[PDB]
Design a protein around this ligand. Structure first.
Ligand SMILES: C[C@H]1O[C@H](O[C@H]2[C@H](O)[C@@H](O)[C@@H](O)O[C@@H]2CO)[C@H](O)[C@@H](O)[C@@H]1N[C@H]1C=C(CO)[C@@H](O)[C@H](O)[C@H]1O
Ligand SMILES: *[C@@H]1O[C@H](CO)[C@@H](O)[C@H](O)[C@H]1NC(C)=O
Ligand SMILES: [Ca+2]
Ligand SMILES: [Cl-]
Length: 496
């Protein structure tokens, strides 16, 4: 559960937040496979509460009603078709499993669900599963409100309701079995792993009991004995009694300190600078690389709903975002997840975005299809960061240098740094307020390389900047602080 059952040579996954099943299946064939992406994290595929006030917010998908594969992304048949086609092209599917809870305790009873299933929060009745009052922690939680009130108390964080969400009694074999039933149905369909949502709100031992009931991946696509890849969402920035290390026995963990610190460093907040990235990784107090799932931003903190503060970089800050993603994809620490989102009307009032609830692009509630423009960009308000030349080429960069050591590091004591990955790739950054022009040792073999950030290598030629590596591995780099993309990356496959 620590290894990504991704195809050999593919090292990243992309989060196609709120994408429809039919759009993902197409993207797997027309883009993801050809460009070397290893997998796709999809939004919760199980039935959720249909919320009309606000109008269909993104977060309604984190309020389960049943485990029926029927949501705004599609039905069960469309979901299976997606997993099959993607798997047939070497692109894995990872499911966002919401298993810590059901929907809000205050939600009105009725059939306001994505598939018409009836449910009654007030009476803890979820017949479509089925679940009853006996399957929740109402009698176990010790707070006066019944909800989590203080994160300094490890017990209520697990036994009480996260912002009102009915908390499942995961200690009960019956509940563990209904969740396993749901997860095993997905595994048998072809899913390669799961993102365990709100893992901090579940005891490590309860998670383990559930994982012990899981099947091995589908033998039609994976080798015998393959275990599903598991990465648990645990926000641990320190200061709390719960540590992400407490979950190492179950699988990988999300390292939120990663995007938070990269954000402050690149923004140059409070005296930080890129030169300090020399010992990036465990040196910064992060969890072991082999237990880490890293990313710059996620669906939560890109809209200020998670943890990380205002330092988090997102597509809104394009120039710096591409640099942050590039550094991440070039550095060997952890398993990388690329974000892919949609645009919403950000409206800041007194320091906060009042429209942080806006759901995916839609027409009367029906999610809009992802349209592709002649320049490979997306329309219908889908950002498609994974399609940006700079990000896509760095995804390939990571594949090419997979396994190579971190070497030939250089820094000017400020914000101009560079490092290589064995003899397969080199990358340089200029985040200072002045130009960079120096000859550095790359460790690469002599030849002419195409800069994969400012261009591509097409039919024997580079469309952008060209780098010349001498016999001794030295190469000259010139990066103006006025350049669109203040960084250059070259690797074994961009050589003429
Ligand atoms: C939304 C988020 O809330 C909780 O995160 C809190 C951290 O645990 C705290 O240490 C502190 O930083 O405040 C955070 C809230 O701002 C919770 O632990 C997370 O798991 C949760 N995020 C996931 C859970 C959901 C509920 O199903 C979803 O709303 C969300 O999209 C998930 O990413
Ligand atoms: C590369 O581009 C140049 C023009 O810029 C052209 O002369 C040359 O033939 C091209 N090389 C190949 C292999 O097509
Ligand atoms: Ca819980
Ligand atoms: Cl996450």
């Amino acid at each position: 559960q620590y290894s990504p059952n991704t195809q050999q040579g593919r090292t990243s996954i992309v989060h196609l937040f709120e994408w429809r099943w039919v759009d993902i299946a197409l993207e797997c064939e027309r883009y993801l496979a050809p460009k070397g992406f290893g997998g796709v994290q999809v939004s919760p595929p199980n039935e959720n509460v249909a919320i009309y006030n606000p109008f269909r917010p993104w977060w309604e998908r984190y309020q389960p009603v049943s485990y029926k594969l029927c949501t705004r992304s599609g039905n069960e048949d469309e979901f299976r078709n997606m997993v099959t086609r993607c798997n047939n092209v070497g692109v894995r599917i990872y499911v966002d499993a919401v298993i810590n809870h059901m929907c809000g305790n205050a939600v009105s009873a009725g059939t306001s669900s994505t598939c018409g299933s009836y449910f009654n929060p007030g009476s803890r009745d979820f017949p479509a599963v089925p679940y009853s009052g006996w399957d929740f922690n109402d009698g176990k939680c010790k707070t006066g409100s019944g909800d989590i009130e203080n994160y300094n108390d490890a017990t209520q964080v697990r036994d009480c309701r996260l912002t009102g969400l009915l908390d499942l009694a995961l200690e009960k074999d019956y509940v563990r079995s209904k969740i396993a039933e749901y997860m095993n149905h997905l595994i048998d369909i072809g899913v390669a792993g799961f993102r365990l949502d709100a893992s901090k709100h579940m005891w490590p031992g309860d998670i383990k009991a559930i994982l012990d009931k899981l099947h091995n991946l589908n033998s039609n696509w994976f080798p015998a004995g393959s275990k599903p890849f598991i990465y648990q969402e645990v926000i641990d920035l320190g200061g709390e009694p719960i540590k992400s290390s407490d979950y190492f026995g179950n699988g990988r963990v999300t390292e939120f300190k990663y995007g938070a610190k990269l954000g402050t460093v690149i923004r140059k907040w409070n005296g930080e600078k890129m030169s300090y990235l020399k010992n990036w990784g465990e040196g910064w107090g992060f969890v072991p690389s082999d237990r880490a799932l890293v990313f710059v931003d996620n669906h939560d903190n890109q809209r200020g709903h998670g943890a990380g503060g205002a330092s988090i970089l997102t597509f809104w800050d394009a120039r710096l975002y591409k640099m942050a993603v590039g550094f991440m994809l070039a550095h060997p620490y952890g398993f990388t997840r690329v974000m892919s989102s949609y645009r919403w009307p950000r409206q800041f009032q007194n320091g906060n975005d009042v429209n942080d609830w806006v759901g995916p692009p839609n027409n009367n509630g029906v999610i809009k299809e992802v349209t592709i423009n002649p320049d490979t960009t997306c329309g219908n308000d889908w950002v498609c960061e994974h399609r940006w030349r700079q990000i896509r080429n760095m995804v390939i960069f990571r594949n090419v240098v997979d396994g190579q050591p971190f070497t030939n590091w250089y820094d000017n004591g400020s914000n101009q740094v560079a490092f290589g990955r064995g003899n397969r790739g080199f990358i340089v950054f200029n985040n200072d307020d002045w130009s960079f022009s120096l000859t550095l040792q790359t460790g690469l073999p002599a030849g002419t390389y195409c800069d994969v950030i400012s261009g591509d290598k097409i039919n024997g030629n580079c469309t952008g900047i060209k780098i010349y590596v001498s016999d001794d591995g030295k190469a000259h780099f010139s990066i103006s602080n006025s350049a669109e993309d203040p960084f250059i990356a070259i690797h074994a496959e961009s050589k003429l």
